[PDB]
Amino acid sequence: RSTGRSALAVLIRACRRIQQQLQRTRRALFQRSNAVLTSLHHVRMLL
Amino acid sequence: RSTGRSALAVLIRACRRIQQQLQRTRRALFQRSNAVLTSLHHVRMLL
Amino acid sequence: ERAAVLQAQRTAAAAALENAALQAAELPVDIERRIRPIEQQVHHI
Amino acid sequence: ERAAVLQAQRTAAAAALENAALQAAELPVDIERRIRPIEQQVH
Amino acid sequence: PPISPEEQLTAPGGDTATAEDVSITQENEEILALVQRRSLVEWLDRGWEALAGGDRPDWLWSRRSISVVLRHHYGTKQRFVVVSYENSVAWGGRRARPPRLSSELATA
């Protein structure tokens, strides 16, 4: 049991931590471009 | 056989599609982010 | 007469600033459509 | 009196392009490090 | 190859807090691990103290951390440079007083 299942605890955690960063790459990449959305509208706000 | 390998394809077909599910997020982020700076190239043609 | 020149240069690029703004606001639409099907696979497998 | 101001605001908006274009110089950059070394893990 | 100083302006890279960029890499090398299962700067001083023959505190911060940022001028469409060393008590230095600047009015 410690060879068959223990070849799988290697490969259950492997997929379940690739999928968790993909929640955090949605959030840490547009809150840098929302400041770009602030400044690009701010160029006409100068005008 | 069926006690050890019938649940492998749950972890196998998951680990053979995130190659495809995230490379489709590559080009759809490089078919859609280049158009912003190209529109910003248009502003330099006017200003 | 320079007021006739510079206001036309301001407002025509101001639509181009909005043609940039309607292209730059298309960018946060992207991954909010990309990983929302990839966030499906999380707790299941 | 307007024509100097209407030029100086226009020169600012011309400079605010490359103030924002160099600020938008990360939009084809911030995506490669958040996708590419993650797919060979899936491999 | 030569050292091109203009590429330090035109290569799109800057500062990051990187604490979010360690957890995004620790949960990225973890899967790889599962599958598998005196400094050089002190020798730079004698590099200068033998070739020059002296200390030269002008050149002492040419060995330490140097950021070279490009910005632009709102009056005549021009460019200019924003500089911060490491040991500068000036802005962007890594030896300065915590109360510095806040980009809050530029966001409010």
3-state secondary structure chain C: CHHHHHHHHHHHHHHHHHHHHHHHCCCCCCHHHHCCCCHHHCCCC
Confirm if A16 and C26 have CB atoms less than 8 A apart: no
The C-alpha angle with vertex C7 and arms to C1 and C9, in degrees rounded to 5, equals: 105
Phi first, then psi: what are they for E35, rounded to 5°? -60, -45
Looking at the complex, report in whole angstroms how far the Cα of residue D3 sits from the nearest Cα belonging to chain C.
6
- Which of A21, A35, A43 comes nearest D16 by C-beta? A43
Cβ contacts of E35 within 8 Å, gap of 6 or more: A10, A14, D41
- The three-class DSSP label of residue D42 is helix
For residue C8, the chain A residues in CB contact (below 8 A) are none
- Which of E20, E24, E31 comes nearest A14 by C-beta? E31
Confirm if A39 and E60 have CB atoms less than 8 A apart: no
**DSSP secondary structure code for residue B43 in this structure:** H
Residue B13: both structure tokens together? 């077909």
Confirm if C6 and B29 have CB atoms less than 8 A apart: no
Cβ contacts of E40 within 8 Å, gap of 6 or more: none
Declared resolution, Å: 5.4
Q: Determine whether the interchain pair B14/A11 forms a contact, defined as Cβ–Cβ distance below 8 Å.
A: no
- Which of B4, B14, B18 comes nearest A4 by C-beta? B4
**Residue reference for tokens 């995230």:** B22
Q: Which of D6, D19, D34, D41 to mutate to test the interface with C (most CBs of C within 10 A)?
A: D6
- If one counts every other C-beta atom within 10 angstroms of the C-beta of residue A21, the result is 20
Chain A neighbours (≥3 Cβ pairs under 8 A) are: B, C, D, E
Q: Determine whether the interchain pair C12/B42 forms a contact, defined as Cβ–Cβ distance below 8 Å.
A: no
Alpha-carbon distance of E37 to C19, in angstroms, equals: 52
- Cα E7 to its chain centre, rounded Å, is 14
Confirm if E47 and E55 have CB atoms less than 8 A apart: no
Alpha-carbon distance of E66 to E15, in angstroms, equals: 12
Confirm if C30 and B32 have CB atoms less than 8 A apart: yes
- In chain D, residues preceding a discontinuity (C to N beyond 2.5 A) are none
Cβ contacts of E94 within 8 Å, gap of 6 or more: E65, E86, E87
- The three-class DSSP label of residue A22 is helix
Please, which residues bridge with residue E71 across strands?
Answer: E80
- Which of D6, D13, D24 comes nearest C7 by C-beta? D6
Alpha-carbon distance of A27 to A20, in angstroms, equals: 12
Cβ contacts of E27 within 8 Å, gap of 6 or more: A17, A18, A20, A21
The C-alpha angle with vertex E52 and arms to E49 and E56, in degrees rounded to 5, equals: 75
Nearest of B42, C35, B21, B40 to residue D28 by alpha carbon: B40
Question: Residue B40 burial by CB count (10 A; 0-12/13-18/19+): exposed, middle or buried?
Answer: buried
Q: Determine whether the interchain pair A17/E24 forms a contact, defined as Cβ–Cβ distance below 8 Å.
A: no
Confirm if C14 and A1 have CB atoms less than 8 A apart: no
**CB pairs < 8 Å spanning D and E:** 33
Alpha-carbon distance of C18 to A40, in angstroms, equals: 9
| β pairing state of E66-72 and E79-85 | antiparallel
Question: Residue B14 burial by CB count (10 A; 0-12/13-18/19+): exposed, middle or buried?
Answer: buried
Dihedral of the alpha carbons of B27, B33, B38, B40, in degrees to the nearest 10: -170
